[PDB]
Write an enzyme that holds these catalytic residues in place. Structure first.
Site, mmCIF file in Angstrom:
data_model
loop_
_atom_site.group_PDB
_atom_site.id
_atom_site.type_symbol
_atom_site.label_atom_id
_atom_site.label_comp_id
_atom_site.label_asym_id
_atom_site.label_seq_id
_atom_site.Cartn_x
_atom_site.Cartn_y
_atom_site.Cartn_z
ATOM 1 C CG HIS B 14 33.878 32.997 34.977
ATOM 2 N ND1 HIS B 14 35.026 33.786 34.109
ATOM 3 C CD2 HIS B 14 34.558 32.235 35.696
ATOM 4 C CE1 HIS B 14 36.201 33.542 34.787
ATOM 5 N NE2 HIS B 14 35.752 32.667 35.418
ATOM 6 C CG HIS B 16 36.273 28.305 38.737
ATOM 7 N ND1 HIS B 16 37.069 27.754 37.762
ATOM 8 C CD2 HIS B 16 36.069 29.880 38.536
ATOM 9 C CE1 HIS B 16 37.612 28.977 37.275
ATOM 10 N NE2 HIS B 16 37.089 30.090 37.596
ATOM 11 C CG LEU B 17 30.169 24.001 38.417
ATOM 12 C CD1 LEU B 17 29.397 22.835 37.432
ATOM 13 C CD2 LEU B 17 29.136 24.343 39.314
ATOM 14 N NE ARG B 18 37.195 25.417 43.219
ATOM 15 C CZ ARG B 18 37.674 26.312 42.781
ATOM 16 N NH1 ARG B 18 38.547 26.190 41.553
ATOM 17 N NH2 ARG B 18 37.991 27.543 42.996
ATOM 18 C CG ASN B 42 40.444 26.755 37.232
ATOM 19 O OD1 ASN B 42 39.041 26.235 37.317
ATOM 20 N ND2 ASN B 42 40.972 27.402 38.087
ATOM 21 C CE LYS B 96 39.302 31.951 31.925
ATOM 22 N NZ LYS B 96 38.654 31.156 33.042
ATOM 23 C CG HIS B 124 42.576 34.982 34.627
ATOM 24 N ND1 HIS B 124 42.030 34.473 35.690
ATOM 25 C CD2 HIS B 124 43.623 35.696 34.942
ATOM 26 C CE1 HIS B 124 42.389 35.057 36.791
ATOM 27 N NE2 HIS B 124 43.632 35.980 36.251
ATOM 28 C CG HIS B 162 37.432 37.350 36.235
ATOM 29 N ND1 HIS B 162 38.548 37.993 35.567
ATOM 30 C CD2 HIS B 162 37.618 36.085 36.118
ATOM 31 C CE1 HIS B 162 39.525 36.745 35.605
ATOM 32 N NE2 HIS B 162 38.998 35.778 35.995
ATOM 33 C CG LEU B 207 44.240 35.871 41.812
ATOM 34 C CD1 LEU B 207 45.422 34.877 41.551
ATOM 35 C CD2 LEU B 207 44.719 36.995 42.161
ATOM 36 C CG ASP B 235 35.959 33.831 38.606
ATOM 37 O OD1 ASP B 235 36.216 32.786 38.262
ATOM 38 O OD2 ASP B 235 37.012 34.628 39.307
ATOM 39 C CG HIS B 239 39.496 27.614 46.929
ATOM 40 N ND1 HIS B 239 40.299 26.625 46.488
ATOM 41 C CD2 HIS B 239 39.512 28.566 46.184
ATOM 42 C CE1 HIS B 239 40.941 26.978 45.186
ATOM 43 N NE2 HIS B 239 40.317 28.342 45.044
ATOM 44 C CB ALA B 251 43.139 33.250 44.285
#
Ligand SMILES: [Cl-]
Ligand SMILES: [Zn+2]
Ligand SMILES: [Zn+2]
Ligand SMILES: [Zn+2]
Ligand SMILES: [Zn+2]
Lengths: 342, 331
Positions: B14, B16-18, B42, B96, B124, B162, B207, B235, B239, B251
């Site tokens: 899980h 997030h690499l953007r 996302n 997802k 989620h 998560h 979150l 997760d 940012h 978040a």
């Protein structure tokens, strides 16, 4: 809504406010003196107001910042483990210091580490008719932040109330149904203040859809079920509950940081915000008691003899307001407030 | 002190690499030692089609022995046909559910297609109802949304992403062989007091939200048990500092710079370093039906300081443990 309907009530007071000091004082005193007859000025400046001399000097700076001619500040002392009974006696004798504040402490902050250490102080306060104001939270590492108020009621407050039955005690800014019940079941010598922000908001406003530090304050916003108990208490008009904003401004940059300061700013529109709560509950008739009668009656001070007029009229709040050389983000920034008071 | 442990090379299920300019920084961090990572969809716009997923995969690999595995973002417009196309590519292994999907009922044909092709449903698990308290959103989701889905699709593999509560731990333990969950490093190391006591700390804001210490303790027990139902999913969700420290802060906590090292501290403190391999390297691939890695990594007990900030494209990110030490290295 803008119905433009009117309500005239006795001029109110604010029984819990932080004005800070120095450059910001012209801005904070302007906001607090707009319509209040009096305000209770909390002592947690830097350094804290721990003596009569410090309280009177701070009062002079407030008056020098040019309040409305109808406004009188009332001062409070900051209690510490070193506070002597003699300082209580001197403070009450001045006629301008009406209360002393108990901030619990553990590098830990100044304050009272143990209630037992200040028993001689509390005795002196009882004797002279000085009110004890309590920030009712323990600071134990083992206790979850949302449980600190409830834990305090059981471990600290109940023993004090039991030992000092003729001491007037205000539980400041109550946030839980547990505190509502405690105050309702304690005697005639126990009362509490309720903020505008703990009536309008709950912890979801701080945390849902993004983290919002301008809603971050101590004691912390609680669940909606606790908020509902506060609304019921405040709008009952009961003599045990009165207006205390705990308006506590910090600069935008100190709020929006890796570690942001606690404090919400409501002094720009406090009675207007309270009016929305009372109106929504269909209990506008009880606003005057909460805002203008219950606090002075409990403090043993006269009520104001002048009136203010609340008008149902919406107005937009600025994104920020001046705060000395910096800015402060007010509650309802960029939104509308539904009443005006003059 | 300078003790060594060799385990099978892990994966992160899980992350997030953007995208865009920050991708060189985030892919550097995730590919340090992972064999594979499950890349969440996302982005902006979200990865809603096979074509988008495959293009994104190519950019990840171009940013530079690490194999990204892709997931689709489900919407009310998602057709069963897109599920079938995505699985056929061989590089999209999951879809997802972000509650996005307004009603679970609208995607029942999609879930049927997922069941049929062996695509995993990642959830989620939070409702967004205004009436529900933020700390209750996970528990409410388990009852209202997840349980009906598990009941209706018994051969659909479902990962509850998560998890943050003892309620979710118990749900997963008591659900069938088709239900598993990921656990982050930050929900193991911290609870809501770290975010709120002595000041508000948005770099801890994520979150689902950090919960009470009692919930944290249930997660530590779950993760360090090595139980097949629990596996590593960071997760990690970076940012820019300016978007974290704002009137309304985003978040997401960043742990990809030291994820397995952070997990090692939890497992070491619990006296269970021998179970780290199962959690990090066996349980996820076994549940996804994929092979385990055949190479090893070495964990060394040696402390190193984390910088106050790290580069994040043209901005910076504040990592978890910024200005503090991490106690292990993994290579
Ligand atoms: Cl009314
Ligand atoms: Zn206070
Ligand atoms: Zn206060
Ligand atoms: Zn998520
Ligand atoms: Zn995620």
């Amino acid at each position: 809504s803008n119905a433009m309907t009117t309500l005239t009530i006795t001029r109110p007071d604010d029984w819990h406010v932080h004005l800070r000091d120095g450059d910001v004082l012209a801005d904070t005193v302007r906001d607090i003196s707009r319509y209040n007859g009096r305000a209770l000025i909390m002592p947690n400046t830097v350094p804290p107001v721990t003596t009569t001399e410090m309280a009177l000097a701070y009062r002079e700076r407030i008056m020098a910042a040019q309040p409305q001619a109808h406004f009188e500040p009332l001062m409070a002392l900051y209690l510490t483990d070193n506070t002597s009974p003699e300082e209580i006696r001197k403070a009450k004798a001045s006629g301008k210091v009406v209360a002393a504040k108990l901030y619990p402490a553990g590098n830990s902050d100044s304050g009272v580490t143990s209630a037992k250490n200040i028993y001689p102080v509390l005795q002196a306060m009882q004797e002279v008719g000085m009110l004890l104001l309590v920030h009712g939270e323990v600071t134990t590492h083992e206790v979850d932040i949302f449980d600190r108020e409830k834990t305090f009621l059981d471990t600290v407050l109940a023993p004090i109330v039991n030992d000092f039955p003729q001491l007037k005690i205000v539980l400041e800014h109550i946030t839980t149904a547990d505190a509502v019940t405690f105050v309702q079941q304690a005697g005639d010598n126990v009362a509490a203040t309720i903020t505008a922000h703990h009536l309008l908001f709950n912890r979801n406003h701080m945390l849902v859809g993004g983290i919002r530090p301008h809603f971050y304050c101590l004691p912390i916003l609680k669940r909606a079920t606790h908020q509902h108990a506060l609304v019921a208490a405040a709008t009952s008009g009961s003599k045990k509950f009165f207006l205390g904003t705990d308006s506590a401004p910090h600069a935008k940059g100190r709020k929006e940081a890796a570690c942001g300061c606690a404090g919400s700013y409501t002094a720009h529109a406090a009675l207007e915000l309270y009016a929305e709560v009372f109106e929504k509950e269909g209990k506008l008739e009880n606003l005057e008691a909460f805002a203008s009668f219950n606090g002075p009656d409990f403090y043993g001070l006269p009520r104001n003899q002048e009136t203010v007029t609340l008008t149902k009229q919406a107005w937009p709040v600025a994104e920020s307001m001046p705060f000395g050389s910096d800015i402060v983000v007010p509650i309802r920034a960029g939104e509308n407030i539904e009443w005006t008071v003059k």
